[PDB]
Curated annotation (Swiss-Prot), chains A, H:
One of its GO terms (molecular function) is calcium ion binding. Ca(2+) 2 binds at D86, N88, D90, Y92, E97. Its main location: endoplasmic reticulum. Residues 30-64, 73-101 form the EF-hand domain. The gene is MCFD2. Ca(2+) 1 binds at D43, D45, N47, E54. It is linked to Factor V and factor VIII combined deficiency 2: A blood coagulation disorder characterized by bleeding symptoms similar to those in hemophilia or parahemophilia, that are caused by single deficiency of FV or FVIII, respectively. The most common symptoms are epistaxis, menorrhagia, and excessive bleeding during or after trauma. Plasma levels of coagulation factors V and VIII are in the range of 5 to 30% of normal. This is Multiple coagulation factor deficiency protein 2. It is found in: Endoplasmic reticulum-Golgi intermediate compartment; Endoplasmic reticulum; Golgi apparatus. GO terms for biological process: protein transport; vesicle-mediated transport. The MCFD2-LMAN1 complex forms a specific cargo receptor for the ER-to-Golgi transport of selected proteins. Plays a role in the secretion of coagulation factors. The keyword Signal applies. Essentially unstructured in the absence of calcium ions. Requires calcium ions for folding. Interacts in a calcium-dependent manner with LMAN1.
UniProtKB/Swiss-Prot annotation, chains C, E:
One of its GO terms (biological process) is negative regulation of protein targeting to mitochondrion. The chain holds residues 42 to 365 of 510 of the full protein. This is Protein ERGIC-53. The gene is LMAN1. GO terms for molecular function: D-mannose binding; metal ion binding; unfolded protein binding. It is a single-pass type I membrane protein; Single-pass membrane protein. Disulfide bonds join C149-C189. Ca(2+) binds at D111, F113, N115, D140. It comes from Homo sapiens (Human).
Swiss-Prot record, chains D, F:
The chain holds residues 41 to 144 of 146 of the full protein. The gene is MCFD2. Ca(2+) 2 binds at D83, N85, D87, Y89, E94. Ca(2+) 1 binds at D41, D43, N45, E52. Disulfide bonds: none annotated. GO terms for molecular function: calcium ion binding. Keywords: Calcium, Disease variant, Endoplasmic reticulum, ER-Golgi transport, Golgi apparatus, Metal-binding, Phosphoprotein, Protein transport, Repeat, Signal, Transport. Essentially unstructured in the absence of calcium ions. Requires calcium ions for folding. Residues 28-61, 70-98 form the EF-hand domain. GO terms for cellular component: endoplasmic reticulum membrane; endoplasmic reticulum-Golgi intermediate compartment membrane; ER to Golgi transport vesicle membrane; Golgi apparatus. This is Multiple coagulation factor deficiency protein 2. It comes from Homo sapiens. It is found in: Endoplasmic reticulum-Golgi intermediate compartment; Endoplasmic reticulum; Golgi apparatus.
């Protein structure tokens, strides 16, 4: 498990996340722009860079019960994401790095 | 130098706490109240102590830590103050700014109360202890203070940001005074050369409240690993020809433009956000003491006006009791 | 009427919190943070709800509570506010000022946020509900408000005191404006007649914080049972000749005087600020002006009464 | 409010210390009692109530906290036979009367 | 009485100093620092003496001068003070408040240092001298003081205004304590009857500073000649039918209104603080309270007069 | 206060600039006189006096400052034949009357 | 390093001015008012410029300058500010802080008015100009500022002292905040390394006042020549065996003790000195705005009390007109 | 002219200088302690060290007319005093240096 393609490719989760601010649900989006929407909606700081804290917030998350992941499990997941995607060893994940995998 | 963000030693908003009410990768003890936007290390109550330490030890040769905090108090005199530690053991409880004495590491103390009576406070005091020197609370630690600078960080319109950088055995503390909302206006405060610290230690931040009361919020705590430009391995041939980076950057920018346009043209379609400007959230302390005085007059006027109208009737009806008779 | 102190439905400093960490005879839940000096029902954080309710039920025909509290905010607007309830069951959680909806009792709400947008807030609203009416949070309960007065209690220099008295089917809310540290400086705010509440109920306080953050501290909560002067039995022959009191009072006064004298010289046996002192002097001067104007009003009323009695003949 | 609880010298001696310390181990039964009455009136109203008495009998001087029902029963029993005017307050007239 | 403005014995802003560096029709000597807005007669430095005196002599039977000034001190005690002289010759240098002793005229002294140690100072003292009495600096001239009132004028928020009027052998000193920016808010301070001063004399102002330093700024000095309503000849047939004034006044008002209208939109054609505004609001509120108390006093006095006229019946 | 001294356009044209600027070289003799009377009343009292006139006829626009006696004589001559109510002030009734 | 006091480039009280009203070895121009205790370079009046420069050029490789000054203002916002120059030519008149623009040297500016509107003021700005860069007054010189620190130096209970040290081509500014009456409590403000300045230059200090008014007093200006410990010639055999130094030191100490005893037993024989403590000379600005408010009440009370007694008579004599009738 | 012995040895000038603070005039003092009094009274700063400024104040001086010395003349006298008495090149003149000449 990790930053799988289907986890980002869930149109329903993206649509239910963009509600309130982006009020235009359309069930015809390509699998390209929805990954982008994921990247924009999970960058809370507005710096256009995904770091470990934002990724862990996305992975743990709260949707309405569900049990929480263990701290060691979350550490392993984020470390596996960073060790295989942060080519520039900055800690942050650029959109190009995100699109690579 | 080269900076790498370390997620295992950081916390930031707006999702600071999880659904179980704990800060990820951090252990909080004492009177700390972690909320989603900030961690209130010590609220505005008498005799409060709080601390948040890292769960896992950090092994960095050179590092940099950026802390955003607010110390807000009603009066002009505050107590006790804030502290940022890089220690060997997690001392989450004690008498030194809400954490234990006799620590094996380095400690930066934001002292708001001048116990020494020398008018040298508020101050930023760097204290490095091997584990055998007690903190002289009655003299603000001036005897064992490695370095100090005299700054004010209480009741500012914007959060105060501090950068503490350990690089080539020199510890540099830079303070953003918080007058401006810019996040990159740091001004130099202090430095200590040939500073020695343990190779592996726990980051932490604590706060304590004495006779006076202040609120010690911490909004973010960003930890960066600093590597020398020459010792860092380049590891080339990993950019995958760098063409897709340029091919994706303009697509990302085009999205940013489109989403900004969509937000712009749907932010006014159904205007329901009340909003909260910073002008409505900031007010000077002394000016506050003026405003209440003004309110004290707004009562007194009424007690005249009614009285005035009372005298009015004694002018009118008495005439009706004069001409009739 | 005759007032009887009730410890069972009261908390007060400076030993408010016992050794175990809770306030005696009172059950607190939510984000309440009790301490030795006061109870912070809801701290200066976003989306905070807190409530302190009595453990044991109260059975009073007529009662009077005095609540000392502060609502402190950095900004000019605060949310949501404080609430004093006399209910039938302790809700202990809900969206109506930190307590449950559909309460069966009486609630005094010190609303500080104008959700109706009519510039009426801050206000004190007395709302009664049998248990079938939902509180209208979107308009500060203006439709079901039994009575309301527009007074300010935020960022006052001294604690705001409220006296809520239910006596002979009449509920009276008197508010200290908070500009003087006197204990008996109450001003009339609101009253309602023919108010019906169950004889069995729990007292409680609560506070809620919205988008803007305010600290809602409650310093004391004294509950008094009020009995009619005629219905109370006299039960005579219980003062034990009324002579020991007279023999002991002057002795106790003399000993406390000599203790004060001892403290006077032994305070210095082994050992205010400018600006703050000036502000205290300013507030004392305003209080002097207020008192003198009130005394002039009383004198003018007496002159009016004398003139009416003179012209009556 | 038993007699021996208020007729002990070490408690009041260690309590008043800090502002007044006049060591004299010859206090009359009405002297240490009067000191006890003076120090436990936190509000400065020269009057004892249920809350002041409840903090008196528990204190912070280890032992587990007494039961809520037991504390309620003992304070109600104290208030039942000592209070004479049924004011909800305990005065030194009633205190020295019983 | 009838007032005539005199330019020859006056200085006023905001063009007080000409191009050559001196105030017109006035000769200043010592440490006076005339500027565009005001004259700093003696700056906040140790042992400073300054004085501004009139060049040409003044021959008025009755006169009235209005002096606007500020005395600002960092400390709570100031020295020595200001002085307004109507003399016979310009001394221009001396130890009596920056001016010479044995003056033949009348001097109003605003003493701010209590050399007598009687806590009377600050005070306003009217001293007259024919030219044979030395001013007693060691006791603030208590022996030779014709009149004195104890009013404060140091570090006031607004300029202190003093009206000194000599009319029909009577000198009246009226002080605006400088708490309101109104031009006609004078209060009575002192008066002396049968005061004799020579008809030929020079007006002047002066200031001196001792061990403690105060800034003695004089903003304006307007001198008015007062003549009796009956002694002034009418000289009729000089208004030129009194119709051109009525034909022109409304036209001038219309043009000034249209100029204000033009400035209203052309101020923004090509482009107060918190705390200071709050202080201004506080002082205006104090002024409104004072005005309403004065109006209540006038109403009460009118009621008293009506009651006396009624009991007369 | 000669007629040509107040009936020149460039002086007020460079004077009023800074807050109001409406370039219009067709001003009536009562219009530029109107502006001249409006701006020289520094005190805002809608009234001219000796001191305002003294700073008016001198200004800061090189030429040596005028003699004190000459200035006194010319302002006395101005005030003698223009003021009719003998108030020590000059109003536009008196100003336009002469 | 080794310090030598230079009298030719200094002035200090309490005999600052001579009998002819000029400062020895210094030329003052503009609105400077030199008094016996201090030089008021620009008084609290609108549009004032003043400067005091050195008459003789000074040729020091390394030097230290200690300036004691006060900037006192009535309001919370002051203008324009103070400046200390080490230039090539004198700068008596000009638009830059009371001195001429286009100076070939170094200039330390104490700026009290934030013209840039960035809330960066009051500030200490080090500007070094070769003779071709104008001073950007509308932007507080932030574009051409070599260094800057944010300190407050207006309305302090004690004089503010600044140490400016040029040593090994590094200009170091340390500012004493003036909270404490100690003369050796300097705190670091700024430094500029590899700073180049003319070998010979004039010292000078200037002050300017804009729309708002402040008083810019200078109490002392002490200039020291700094020499390296290795380059300084020792020139031995000049102490004359050093025995008389020890033989005279204790005699001097004994005389100091005797004179102190005489002054102690004489100062109470005829007590006539009034004295002026520092508590009676210092008061905070905001508290001042409170105190006048208090005075504003002391008037209002009177207007009630008399009114009160007036109502008193209408209670008394009316009774005398009621029982009689 | 300069720091001559008779200039320091004028008992009348010393006595008239110490008046107001030292009112014990006695015309029997040795020529040793009067130099001490001179040194103490001409050190206004209280640092027990005579620099150029205090010496120039002492030399120019005001006693109650007399013409003032030229600035170049005062510079020459002070430089001559410093070049022949300041042995340690400190700028200040210690009491031992004062007693040397
Ligand atoms: Ca990010
Ligand atoms: Ca990356
Ligand atoms: Ca401290
Ligand atoms: Ca300290
Ligand atoms: Ca509401
Ligand atoms: Ca409302
Ligand atoms: Ca009590
Ligand atoms: Ca009782
Ligand atoms: Ca005096
Ligand atoms: Ca006196
Ligand atoms: Ca005018
Ligand atoms: Ca006229
Ligand atoms: Ca500036
Ligand atoms: Ca700036
Ligand atoms: Ca010296
Ligand atoms: Ca030497
Ligand atoms: Zn989601
Ligand atoms: Zn002109
Ligand atoms: Zn001498």
């Amino acid at each position: 498990m990790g930053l799988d393609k289907n986890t980002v490719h869930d149109q329903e989760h993206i649509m239910e996340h963009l509600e309130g601010v982006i009020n235009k649900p359309e069930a015809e989006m390509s699998p390209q722009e929805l990954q982008l929407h994921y990247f924009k909606m999970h960058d809370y700081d507005g710096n256009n860079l995904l770091d470990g804290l934002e990724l862990s917030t996305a992975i743990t998350h709260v949707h309405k019960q569900a049990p929480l992941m263990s701290e060691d499990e979350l550490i392993n997941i984020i470390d596996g994401v960073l060790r295989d995607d942060d080519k520039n060893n900055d800690g942050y994940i650029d959109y190009a790095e995100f699109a690579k995998s | 130098p080269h900076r790498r963000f370390e997620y295992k030693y950081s916390f930031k908003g707006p999702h600071l706490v999880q659904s179980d009410g704990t800060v990820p990768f951090w252990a909080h003890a004492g009177n700390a109240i972690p909320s989603s936007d900030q961690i209130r290390v010590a609220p505005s109550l008498k005799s409060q102590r709080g601390s948040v330490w890292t769960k896992t030890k950090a092994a960095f040769e050179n590092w940099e830590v950026e802390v955003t905090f607010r110390v807000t108090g009603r009066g002009r005199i505050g107590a006790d103050g804030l502290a940022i530690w890089y220690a060997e053991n997690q001392g989450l409880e004690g008498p030194v700014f809400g954490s234990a004495d006799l620590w094996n590491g380095v400690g930066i103390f934001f002292d708001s109360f001048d116990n020494d009576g020398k008018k040298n406070n508020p101050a930023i005091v760097i204290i490095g202890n091997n584990g055998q020197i007690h903190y002289d609370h009655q003299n603000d630690g001036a005897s064992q203070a490695l370095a100090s600078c005299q700054r004010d960080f209480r009741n500012k319109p914007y959060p105060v940001r501090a950068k503490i950088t350990y690089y080539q055995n020199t510890l540099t503390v830079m303070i953003n005074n918080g007058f401006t909302p810019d996040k990159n206006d740091y001004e130099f405060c202090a430095k200590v050369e040939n500073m020695i610290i343990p190779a592996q230690g726990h980051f932490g931040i604590s706060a304590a409240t004495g006779g006076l009361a202040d609120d010690h919020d911490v909004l973010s705590f960003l930890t960066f690993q600093l590597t020398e430009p020459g010792k860092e391995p380049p590891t080339p041939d990993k950019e995958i020809s760098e063409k897709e980076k340029e091919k994706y950057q303009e697509e990302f920018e085009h999205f940013q433009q489109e989403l900004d346009k969509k937000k712009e043209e749907f932010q006014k379609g159904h205007p329901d956000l009340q909003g909260q400007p910073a002008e409505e959230i900031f007010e000077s302390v002394g000016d506050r003491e003026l405003r209440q005085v003004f309110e004290g007059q707004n009562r007194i006027h009424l007690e005249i006006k009614q009285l005035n109208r009372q005298l009015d009737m004694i002018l009118d009806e008495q005439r009706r009791y004069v001409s009739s008779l």
